[PDB]
Design a binder for this molecule. Structure first.
Ligand SMILES: O=c1ccn([C@H]2C[C@H](O)[C@@H](COP(=O)(O)NP(=O)(O)OP(=O)(O)O)O2)c(=O)[nH]1
Ligand SMILES: [Mn+2]
Ligand SMILES: [Mn+2]
Ligand SMILES: [Mn+2]
Ligand SMILES: [Mn+2]
Ligand SMILES: [Mn+2]
Length: 903
DNA sequence: TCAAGTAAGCAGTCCGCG
DNA sequence: GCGGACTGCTTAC
């Protein structure tokens, strides 16, 4: 097989590499790497190396990496550019793997671990590590085994061995319900003292040294705890055995509120699953506890136990170990669904970077572009420092707040990358400038054509047409992957809807789920077979279709994020190819494109409807338009339509056959106007929205920019079995809104759009009547706890103190003197509840760490003093009043003359 | 040599207000 | 009490 790297590190003048050889064996080597950098040379000099602007360079080959670094500094002191890749391990990777890397994941050791530490005196701080590690479960992907290290004797209690027999039993039978499918994969190892546990763990680690190291909060808790615990018991050099090269660094991570200390283990690639989840999931969760996320992702139940975790080992050691094991499995289950590890490996090897560098779009693109240029013997420019400058972005149209009955939306495919490709925007394709007219003159086609010769953006930039830039070239390759995967996602989605429609009428028999590839639209033959299947088989097929869809979503959305990341990186001062001329060439072109096509669509629709000057486009954000289809429907009638699906079919066909060619004609004209390299403005129909035929539903509404709701029947060719609410920006979509309130507001919206005013009013009255019975957690707001200390003046709120911070301070005063109460961690999320006046907490609100029950000490007081009236008014009524005023209706009737006896 | 972007809405505090 | 000038948090893109 072809060779691939596992990890790479630079240590002094040495590159340390772990890799898979031609026989598929893991190896390690230390290389005294001889890097090259480049300097501009005279035209007289015969060379094969040119910078990106075609200027000749001379290669400087150095005896070691230290000498290369010194030369860089000398060059800066002289005042001359030092060209080439200054991150030497990327150069090493590029030289060592001078081909497209095909990796074999089964050869890569992926480890997933979780540790338990009993602490009777608060959170066990990793920097101190003053408490015994009393459990470690470590799953190894190569062995496919969960290795469990269990401490039986400690200063906080001596316990008996954990029972696998009891572990497998159902909870309702006194067991722990450790999933049956991993019971046979457990290797259990009890220890009578911590020293031998930790020593065995280190020996084990040497035999099975992780390449990718993952888990939940491993980077911030487990890794530094283990390192420091070992350091404190055995000494520093023993703790350095966690690194295959015996080198570690206490690294300081900094943000706008403070800093934290992690441990870099050289020769390991740490991908903390919490960080993978935050980057790749595109959710914003009220809580990031593993229990909460597992429940969200997998619909598993909460792992129940009596008392606090600080006393769980002593009271129920059996469950303690079982839950440690299950926690490791939960991350494996989340990854089996989401496939973030596979994504990271794909991306890391594609770029030729350390796998952990997938967190940095800038590092990823620097490597991709370097490797692309190196292949053509081109030399990359030196990184330069730049002051941060604000610059303009997208256009957002101001909507008229209103109900909108029939709506059809259109959206530009991968806009910013498509602009890069159409215009041919790259550092080395810049051709010059032209004199800019006001943007509205380009939008209206009244400004003179910028150039007959070059490809243009309305920001004043011109680009060469007759050759590709490295940025267009490399962005295209990733875009084409994104397109492939999105196609798989949408087919899986379409397939799901077919299955959902068959679930309406089973059809009782004993059969099997059909073996199909869900990534491609089912054939007629498969569709026929599906109609004959049982509910059990269909539900299994639906599960598989949805998992295929999530896999396609993971693969497409994050490749989209990566290419959009390249467009944004052009506006980040740390990017080697930073250039506001290129960043603004993109954003300005986008503003023009949106507003240009708004005009063209309004023009076209007026024309076909036999009218003049009517406004069809009601809204647009960056690269979308929302078109009022009321006149299109009215042109026909109502009541020419048999059912809802009839008018949906009509609008679908109208969009594809009529509007789409006009949109394309429109964008082709704009492409000729800007004299661009390639026409790539492709605006697909997205949503078809409206009320059920014959209902009193309002279809949709807008309250303002980035705030709207639509009752959608078809989305990008997915025809829903049941209408789906598309809600953007409203409180239902915000993680700060209480769970039960998100639910109630969504139902209010559903009733508005599908059923009408009376149905809304009916629901509002019931919810108001029953609000006070909802579980306190379901009605608590959520916020991030940033800059707590800043506002803490002797335990009390300082000036400007945010509401949620005041809550934290109230909590801190309430728990002072209790070592068992969970501390609010700076930057994490909290639940927030308002308190009635005269409460014993002495303030108007309280806040506690989210995803948790509030500590039992003050629980009863919080419940007693909660202000339901303020809760209702702030989280539910205020937003609902915004929706209903926009939509021109009332959530309450509503005094009128009709005061007689209407029974 | 660590290091995608801008636009924009709502909720809160502070403070003015015979 | 409201509305305006800020911050803080958050979402759409
Ligand atoms: O995270 C983002 C999202 C959008 N944008 C910009 C770039 C993107 O091309 C543009 C339009 O946003 P869309 O949500 O329409 N995504 P895009 O057009 O890139 O892909 P598509 O619409 O094909 O899923 O807004 C970003 O810069 N960062
Ligand atoms: Mn014993
Ligand atoms: Mn645990
Ligand atoms: Mn788009
Ligand atoms: Mn699209
Ligand atoms: Mn869009």
């Amino acid at each position: 097989m072809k060779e691939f790297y596992l990890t790479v590190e630079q240590i002094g003048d040495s590159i340390f590499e772990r890799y898979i050889d031609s026989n598929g064996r893991e190896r390690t080597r230390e290389v005294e790497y001889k890097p090259s950098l480049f300097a501009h040379c005279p035209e007289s000099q015969a060379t094969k190396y040119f910078d990106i602007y075609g200027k000749p360079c001379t290669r400087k080959l150095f005896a070691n990496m230290r000498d290369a670094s010194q030369w860089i500094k000398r060059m800066e002191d002289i005042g001359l550019e030092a060209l080439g890749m200054d991150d030497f391990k990327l150069a090493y990777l590029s030289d060592t793997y001078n081909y497209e890397i095909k990796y074999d994941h089964t050869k890569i050791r992926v480890a997933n671990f979780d540790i338990e530490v009993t602490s009777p005196d608060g959170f066990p701080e990793p920097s101190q590590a003053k408490h015994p590690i009393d459990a470690i479960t470590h799953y190894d992907s190569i062995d496919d085994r969960f290795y469990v290290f269990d401490l039986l004797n400690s200063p906080y209690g001596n316990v008996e061995e954990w029972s696998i027999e009891i572990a497998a039993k159902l909870q309702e039978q006194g067991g722990d319900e450790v999933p049956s499918e991993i019971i046979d994969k457990i290797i259990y190892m009890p220890f009578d003292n911590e020293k031998e546990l930790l020593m065995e763990y280190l020996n084990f680690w040497q035999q099975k040294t992780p390449v990718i190291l993952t888990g939940w909060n491993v980077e911030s808790f487990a890794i530094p705890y283990v390192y420091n615990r070992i350091k404190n018991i055995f000494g520093e050099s023993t703790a350095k055995r966690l690194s295959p090269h015996r080198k570690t660094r206490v690294k300081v991570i900094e943000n706008m509120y403070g800093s934290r200390e992690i441990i870099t283990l050289f020769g390991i690639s740490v991908l903390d699953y919490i960080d993978l989840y935050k980057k790749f999931s595109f959710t914003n969760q009220p809580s990031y506890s593993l229990d909460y996320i597992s429940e969200f992702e997998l619909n598993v139940g909460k792992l129940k136990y009596d008392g606090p975790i600080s006393k769980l080992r002593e009271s129920n050691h059996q469950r303690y170990i079982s839950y440690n094991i299950i926690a490791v499995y939960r991350v494996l289950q989340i990854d089996a669904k989401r496939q973030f590890i596979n994504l990271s490996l794909d991306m890391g090897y594609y770029a030729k970077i350390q796998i952990q560098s997938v967190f940095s779009p800038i590092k990823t693109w620097d490597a991709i572009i370097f490797n692309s240029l190196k292949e053509q013997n081109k030399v990359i420019p030196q990184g330069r420092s730049h002051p941060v400058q604000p610059y303009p972005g997208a256009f957002v149209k101001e909507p008229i707040p209103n109900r909108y009955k029939y709506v059809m939306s259109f959206d530009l495919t991968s806009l910013y990358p498509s602009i890069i490709r159409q215009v041919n925007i790259s550092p080395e394709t810049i051709a010059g400038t032209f004199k800019v007219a006001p943007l509205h003159d380009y939008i209206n086609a009244v400004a003179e054509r910028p150039s007959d010769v070059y490809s243009c953006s309305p920001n004043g930039m011109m680009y060469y047409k007759d050759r590709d830039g490295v940025v267009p070239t490399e962005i295209t390759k990733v875009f084409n992957q994104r397109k492939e995967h999105k196609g798989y996602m949408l087919a899986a989605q379409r397939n799901g809807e077919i299955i959902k429609e068959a679930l309406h009428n089973p059809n009782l028999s004993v059969d099997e789920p059909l073996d199909v590839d869900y990534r491609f639209d089912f054939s007629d033959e498969i569709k026929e077979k599906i109609k004959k299947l049982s509910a059990k088989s269909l539900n299994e097929m639906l599960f598989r279709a949805q998992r295929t869809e999530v896999a396609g979503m993971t693969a497409q959305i994050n490749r989209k994020a990566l290419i959009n990341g390249l467009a944004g990186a052009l506006g980040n001062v740390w990017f080697r190819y930073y250039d506001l001329r290129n960043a603004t060439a993109i954003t300005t072109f986008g503003q023009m494109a949106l507003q240009w096509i708004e005009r063209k669509v309004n023009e076209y629709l007026n024309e076909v409807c036999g009218t003049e000057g009517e406004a069809f486009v009601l809204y647009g954000d960056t690269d979308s338009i929302y078109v009022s289809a009321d006149k299109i429907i009215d042109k026909v009638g109502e009541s020419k339509f048999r059912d809802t699906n009839h008018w949906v079919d009509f609008l679908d066909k109208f969009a594809r056959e009529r509007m789409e060619p006009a949109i394309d004609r429109g964008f082709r004209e704009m492409c000729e106007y800007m004299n661009n390299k390639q026409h790539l403005m492709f605006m697909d129909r997205e949503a078809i929205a409206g009320p059920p035929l014959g209902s009193k539903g309002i279809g949709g509404f807008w309250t303002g920019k980035k705030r709207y709701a639509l009752n959608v029947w078809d989305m990008e060719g997915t025809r829903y079995a049941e209408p789906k609410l598309k809600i953007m920006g409203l409180e239902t979509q915000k993680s700060s809104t209480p769970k039960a309130v998100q639910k109630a507001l969504k139902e209010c919206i559903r009733r508005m759009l599908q059923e009408g005013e009376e149905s809304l009013q009916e629901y509002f009255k019931e919810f108001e009547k029953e609000f006070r019975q909802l579980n306190y957690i379901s009605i608590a707001s959520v916020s991030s706890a940033n800059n707590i200390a800043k506002y803490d003046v002797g335990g009390f709120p300082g000036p400007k103190c945010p509401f949620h911070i005041r809550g934290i301070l109230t909590y801190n005063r309430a728990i002072k003197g209790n070592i068992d109460a969970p501390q609010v961690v700076e930057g994490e999320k909290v639940y927030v509840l308002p308190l009635r006046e005269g409460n014993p907490f002495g303030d108007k609100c309280i806040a506690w760490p989210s995803g948790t029950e509030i500590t039992d000490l003050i629980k009863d007081d919080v419940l007693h003093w909660m202000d339901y009236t303020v809760l209702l008014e702030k989280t539910f009524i205020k937003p609902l009043e915004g929706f209903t005023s926009a939509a021109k209706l009332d959530y309450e009737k509503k005094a009128s003359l009709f005061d007689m006896f209407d029974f």
